[PDB]
Every structure is written in C-alpha cells, then in structure tokens.
Amino acid sequence: TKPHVNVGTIGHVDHGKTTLTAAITTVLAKTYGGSHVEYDTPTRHYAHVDCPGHADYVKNMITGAAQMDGAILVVAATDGPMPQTREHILLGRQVGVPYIIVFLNKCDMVDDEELLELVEMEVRELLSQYDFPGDDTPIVRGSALKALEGDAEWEAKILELAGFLDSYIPEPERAIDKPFLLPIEDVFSISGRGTVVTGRVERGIIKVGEEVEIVGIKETQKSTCTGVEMFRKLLDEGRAGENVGVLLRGIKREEIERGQVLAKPGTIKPHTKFESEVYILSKDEGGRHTPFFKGYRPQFYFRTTDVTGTIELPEGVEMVMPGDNIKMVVTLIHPIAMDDGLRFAIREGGRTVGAGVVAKVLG
Amino acid sequence: AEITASLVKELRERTGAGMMDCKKALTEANGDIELAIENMRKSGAIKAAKKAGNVAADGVIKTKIDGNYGIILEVNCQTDFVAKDAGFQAFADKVLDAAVAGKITDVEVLKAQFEEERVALVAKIGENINIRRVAALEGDVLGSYQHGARIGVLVAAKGADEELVKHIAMHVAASKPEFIKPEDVSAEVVEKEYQVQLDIAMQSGKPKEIAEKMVEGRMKKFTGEVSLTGQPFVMEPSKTVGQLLKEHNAEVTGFIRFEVGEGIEKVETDFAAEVAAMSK
Ligand SMILES: Nc1nc2c(ncn2[C@@H]2O[C@H](COP(=O)(O)OP(=O)(O)O)[C@@H](O)[C@H]2O)c(=O)[nH]1
Ligand SMILES: [Cl-]
Numbered sequence: 001t002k003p004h005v006n007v008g009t010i011g012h013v014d015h016g017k018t019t020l021t022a023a024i025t026t027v028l029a030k031t032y033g034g035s036h037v038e039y040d041t042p043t044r045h046y047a048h049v050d051c052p053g054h055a056d057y058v059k060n061m062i063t064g065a066a067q068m069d070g071a072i073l074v075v076a077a078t079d080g081p082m083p084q085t086r087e088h089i090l091l092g093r094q095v096g097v098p099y100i101i102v103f104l105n106k107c108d109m110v111d112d113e114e115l116l117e118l119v120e121m122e123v124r125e126l127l128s129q130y131d132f133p134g135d136d137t138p139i140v141r142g143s144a145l146k147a148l149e150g151d152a153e154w155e156a157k158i159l160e161l162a163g164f165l166d167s168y169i170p171e172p173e174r175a176i177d178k179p180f181l182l183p184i185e186d187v188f189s190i191s192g193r194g195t196v197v198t199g200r201v202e203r204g205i206i207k208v209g210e211e212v213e214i215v216g217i218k219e220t221q222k223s224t225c226t227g228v229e230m231f232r233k234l235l236d237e238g239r240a241g242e243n244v245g246v247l248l249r250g251i252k253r254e255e256i257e258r259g260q261v262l263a264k265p266g267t268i269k270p271h272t273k274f275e276s277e278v279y280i281l282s283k284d285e286g287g288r289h290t291p292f293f294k295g296y297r298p299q300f301y302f303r304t305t306d307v308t309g310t311i312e313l314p315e316g317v318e319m320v321m322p323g324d325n326i327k328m329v330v331t332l333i334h335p336i337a338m339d340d341g342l343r344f345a346i347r348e349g350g351r352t353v354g355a356g357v358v359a360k361v362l363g
Numbered sequence: 364a365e366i367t368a369s370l371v372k373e374l375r376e377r378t379g380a381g382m383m384d385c386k387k388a389l390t391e392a393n394g395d396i397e398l399a400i401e402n403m404r405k406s407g408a409i410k411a412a413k414k415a416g417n418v419a420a421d422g423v424i425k426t427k428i429d430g431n432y433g434i435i436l437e438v439n440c441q442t443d444f445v446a447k448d449a450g451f452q453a454f455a456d457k458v459l460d461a462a463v464a465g466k467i468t469d470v471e472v473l474k475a476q477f478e479e480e481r482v483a484l485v486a487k488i489g490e491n492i493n494i495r496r497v498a499a500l501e502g503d504v505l506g507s508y509q510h511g512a513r514i515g516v517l518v519a520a521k522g523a524d525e526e527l528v529k530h531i532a533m534h535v536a537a538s539k540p541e542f543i544k545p546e547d548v549s550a551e552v553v554e555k556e557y558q559v560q561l562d563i564a565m566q567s568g569k570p571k572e573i574a575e576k577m578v579e580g581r582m583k584k585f586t587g588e589v590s591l592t593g594q595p596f597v598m599e600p601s602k603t604v605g606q607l608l609k610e611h612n613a614e615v616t617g618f619i620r621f622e623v624g625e626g627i628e629k630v631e632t633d634f635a636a637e638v639a640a641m642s643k
C-alpha cells in the first residue's frame with residue numbers, strides 16, 4: 001500500500017515537459033516493472049499533472065485537484081531560464097509548493113560544461129529570489145528525448161530524477177497519522193451513557209480514555225472519550241475514514257453543536273479572519289448569473305456547516321464575475337476550527353456558487 | 364576577442380537571449396557584443412516566424428485615455444504566464460502609449476512600427492506574440508475599466524462624473540451590450556429577428572394570432588437586452604442603465620469592449636493522452 005505523492009511539471013512550452021514525463025513512465029516501467037499520468041518507484045506511487053496555465057492551475061487547486069507535494073521545473077539547458085520562468089516559480093511560491101526539483105533538459109545539445117554551469121547558477125539564483133532553497137535544490141542533467149529512445153547513459157538520469165523524487169520529497173503524511181479530528185455532524189444524549197457526537201473521522205485515531213477538545217463556533221471545551229461506536233456496536237478506537245459515534249464524559253447535549261470539531265487537545269484553533277484563494281462558478285457550472293460587489297455577504301461552508309462572512313476584495317478590484325478566481329480576505333461572524341489549506345464552499349441561500357481554500361489565517 | 368563564459372553571460376544579461384544562441388552569435392561576431400546583438404536580430408526574425416503559426420489566444424487588453432481620445436488594445440501571447448511577464452507587459456504598454464500619442468487606429472500601422480521589437484521579444488520569450496487589434500473612442504468625457512488583464516472597456520459620456528462613467532464601464536464589461544439604445548437596432552435586423560422568433564413560436568404549436576402577439580413582446584425584450592440603456596444596471600438591477608442615466612441627467616455616446624481571445628478557438632490539450640502517445 002505504497003505512499004502517494006502528487007507531482008507536476010512546470011516550464012516553458014517547448015522545453016520538453018511532455019517528453020520528460022513520457023520518459024519517466026517509460027524508464028520506470030522498464031526498470032521496476034508495471035487528466036493525469038501515473039508511475040511507480042519501488043517505494044513510491046506518483047500522480048503527475050502538467051501546469052500549463054497560472055489561473056487554470058489555481059482554479060483546479062481550489063475545485064479539488066490535490067495540491068502538489070513537489071514540482072519538477074523543466075528548463076532546457078540550450079536556452080536556460082526564460083523571462084517567464086520567474087512566473088513559473090512565482091506560481092509555485094503562490095500555491096505553496098513545498099519542494100521544487102529541477103530537470104535540466106536537452107543536455108545532449110550542449111557540450112561546454114561551463115555553459116551548463118552558467119545555466120545551473122541562473123536557476124539556483126531564480127529559485128532563491130522566491131525563497132526556494134536554491135543552494136540545496138536538486139538539479140538533474142538529462143535528455144528527455146534520448147532517454148525515451150532508450151539511450152542507456154540518459155536513462156540513468158531519469159532514474160536519478162526519480163531518485164530525488166523519492167528522497168527529496170518527504171513521504172506525505174497519511175490521514176491516520178495526523179492528530180485526531182472529527183467534524184461533528186449530529187449530537188444526542190443517551191440516558192445511561194451520556195452525550196454522543198457523530199461524524200466521519202477526518203484524521204487520526206480516537207480511543208476510549210483520551211481527552212478531546214470541542215472547537216469552533218462557541219468557546220472551546222474539553223472532554224474525555226468514554227466510548228466509540230459504529231452501528232450501535234462498541235469499538236475500542238475510531239480511525240480516519242470511519243463513521244462513528246463518540247461518547248463524551250460530562251458534557252451535555254446542548255453544549256455541543258454541528259459544525260464544531262472534536263480534536264486532539266492543542267492541535268486546532270478557532271479563527272474568524274483569513275486570507276483565501278477563491279473560485280466563483282460560471283453560469284454553466286450552475287453558479288450565479290450575475291457579478292457581485294464589495295458588500296457581497298455569502299456563507300462559508302466549513303466541513304459540515306455554513307458561517308456567514310463579509311469580504312474584502314483585493315486592491316483595485318471592485319467586481320467579481322462568474323468564472324473569476326481571486327484572492328479575498330474573509331471575516332466570519334463567529335469562529336470556526338481551521339488551518340491553512342482548509343477547503344470551503346461559498347454559498348448563498350444554501351446553494352454552492354463558489355469554492356475557496358484558506359491561504360493564511362489572520363485572527 | 365576570446366569567447367569566455369563571462370562574455371556569454373554579459374550578452375545574456377544584456378539580451379535575455381538563450382544561452383546557446385548567445386554563444387553562437389558572439390562567436391560568429393569575434394566577441395563584438397554589438398555585432399552579436401545585430402546577428403541575433405536577423406536570427407530572431409526566423410525564430411519568430413517559426414512561432415507565428417502558433418495559436419495565441421491569451422494575453423492582455425489595455426486601455427488609455429488622453430483627454431477626449433481613448434485607445435483600447437489587444438496584444439496576444441500563448442500562455443497567461445507570459446501575459447503576466449514584465450517584458451510582455453512593458454511591450455504592450457509601449458504599443459498602447461504610441462497608439463494614443465499618434466492617434467493610431469490602423470492596427471497594421473501599429474504592427475509595422477513595432478515589428479522588430481515584437482520579434483526581439485518573441486526571440487526571448489519563445490511564444491508567438493501578436494498585436495491583434497486597436498480601436499479609438501472619442502468623447503466629451505471618457506472613462507475606462509479593466510477587469511484584470513482579460514476585459515477592457517472604454518465609455519464615452521456627457522454629463523456623467525468619474526464614478527458614474529466607471530460604473531457604466533463595469534456594467535459594459537459584465538453585460539456586453541452591442542448597441543447604446545434599443546432604437547439603435549436597425550429595422551432590418553429587428554425584422555429578421557421577428558421572423559426567427561415567429562418561426563420558432565409557430566412550430567411549437569402556438570396559433571398564429573397568438574404567436575404574432577408573443578413575438579412582438581419578444582422584440583421589445585430583444586432590443587432591450589442587446590442595448591446598454593435597456594439592460595438592468597448590474598450594480599442595481601431593479602433599474603435599467605437608461606433609468607440610471609436619466610437620474611443623473613447623463614447620456615452615453617459610445618463604448619467599446621474588448622475581451623482577450625474573442626473569436627479565437629483555443630487549443631484543446633490532453634496531457635495524459637499526449638504523454639501516452641510518445642511512450643507507446
Ligand atoms: N534535443 C532534444 N529535444 C527534446 C528533448 N525533449 C523534448 N524534445 C523536443 O522538444 C520539442 C518539444 O518537446 P515537448 O515535450 O513537446 O515540450 P512541452 O511543450 O514542454 O511538453 C519536441 O520536438 C521534442 O521531441 C531533449 O531532451 N532533447
Ligand atoms: Cl453583491
């Protein structure tokens with residue numbers, strides 16, 4: 001059940017991103033056996049997208065496409081970086097791609113080592129200018145094409161790139177390894193047992209005897225789990241992905257509500273104000289038919305409940321049309337449990353008209 | 364002069380040209396930087412020609428006003444990464460400035476003046492770039508609105524303050540009227556559309572006398588919805604823009620709306636499919 005890593009290629013049209021990706025699949029299949037592409041190293045499973053457009057990538061990130069755990073910046077060594085290469089890296093910085101590996105392509109077309117060096121140093125400098133660790137960045141010297149045609153020397157460099165995917169991108173964290181969190185869907189009391197909340201364990205594990213915090217909407221409370229059950233059957237623990245009822249010591253029915261979360265103590269906080277990246281559905285996707293303006297006052301749907309919020313549009317923006325994607329600062333009317341990367345829907349009258357992701361928590 | 368890594372760097376720091384293009388140019392030029400730059404000029408025309416058949420459906424709309432005279436402009440490229448690039452931007456701003464200063468409405472005149480600078484930019488950036496269209500609006504009062512880089516609008520008005528013109532330009536950006544007033548729609552066009560709607564209404568089983576009356580209603584809806592003053596004002600749709608203008612004792616004498624890539628079919632791509640092809 002090997003780890004899953006989401007990667008993507010970013011680079012100039014013509015520098016060989018499609019060819020590199022074909023070479024990766026070909027050589028890994030040849031070596032280790034057998035819109036997105038997939039391939040496998042002995043220890044990792046990869047899902048690989050291309051990043052052809054800035055707005056398209058930001059939109060897909062918001063509307064559900066899993067975020068990249070790492071990106072492969074493809075730069076042909078014949079040219080070196082393009083003026084828009086800083087826009088490629090700037091996208092990476094914008095969406096918080098945590099790691100960038102460089103594949104220097106077309107090195108079969110370049111003999112002077114001192115020129116490859118000049119290209120390498122330009123890339124490291126560019127990376128650093130946007131706070132990626134340029135000095136420590138893996139840079140592979142390869143030929144996507146000649147590797148695809150089965151040339152042995154160049155096949156090695158594909159394997160080297162896959163080596164860095166394996167070693168330089170940390171094993172992503174499985175949901176079950178994360179601190180316990182359960183979004184509360186319903187609440188009731190059992191005469192002889194007490195208060196029970198239900199929902200789907202989003203991450204981690206809750207066991208009998210462990211403390212939990214109840215977070216969001218109202219002031220945080222603390223309690224102890226005295227039981228976990230599934231289909232009226234008592235369990236010793238509830239795990240990420242299971243639908244459960246968590247029995248709680250002391251706390252009463254009317255002190256908990258839908259939209260709050262159960263969490264491992266100290267691991268998630270309530271917030272009201274945050275920066276986000278937002279995408280507003282087009283009419284054809286079932287969204288609004290008309291634009292909204294500064295006083296737009298929608299609901300922000302976090303996990304299991306709507307929270308009304310007011311919006312601040314970025315400087316110089318006074319109108320938002322269906323199909324637009326923009327940054328906005330949101331102030332909710334009461335707190336909700338959240339951290340960076342939390343996804344939400346935007347709704348009006350209970351109908352989804354947009355989607356967003358929390359980019360930075362403010363207050 | 365000897366062709367060192369340092370000299371190549373200097374020509375690259377200077378031109379943004381590809382590393383190898385720089386070495387080749389500089390070598391052929393015996394190290395004369397200025398001659399290398401001139402060599403790269405003739406090469407660049409051929410690099411640009413290679414790209415000129417590439418669909419360029421991204422890019423920017425820009426607008427600029429100089430008193431009673433305004434310019435709206437479309438400059439295309441292939442990806443929004445280049446549309447955001449500072450060099451591409453400065454090029455589009457330079458073309459815009461010259462069109463305003465020279466009152467240039469013939470896009471071929473504009474193209475000719477900037478062709479060499481276009482080629483040098485294409486040789487650096489490696490995307491097709493095209494000065495696609497330009498138009499002027501003249502008016503008593505002019506205002507503009509930019510919806511990001513993708514939609515630009517000019518509006519000409521009379522008796523309207525800065526804020527009102529702006530809101531009307533925003534309305535045009537969102538609602539894309541193609542006439543100012545419903546009475547501006549020609550009798551010929553109205554009669555054609557009448558026939559369209561009567562045909563549709565009849566085959567749907569409506570008796571003729573009923574269909575005729577319904578279609579006369581559709582004609583008022585039709586001229587209302589393609590015209591600025593007949594459209595509900597986007598910032599307060601309980602009123603038309605016409606009512607808005609009456610309230611302010613104003614009128615609109617003109618508008619132009621450009622949107623990037625209008626009338627260009629954009630190239631559909633399946634990365635997964637393309638990758639599969641290459642490997643198999
Ligand atoms: N010489 C050489 N050409 C390459 C290499 N990789 C790709 N190409 C060629 O460069 C062109 C564009 O590559 P492609 O993968 O389609 O670029 P993409 O638009 O970034 O996906 C094609 O003619 C490829 O065959 C390489 O390593 N060496
Ligand atoms: Cl609104």
Ligand SMILES: [Cl-]
Nearest residue numbers: 547548549552
């Ligand atoms: Cl007409």
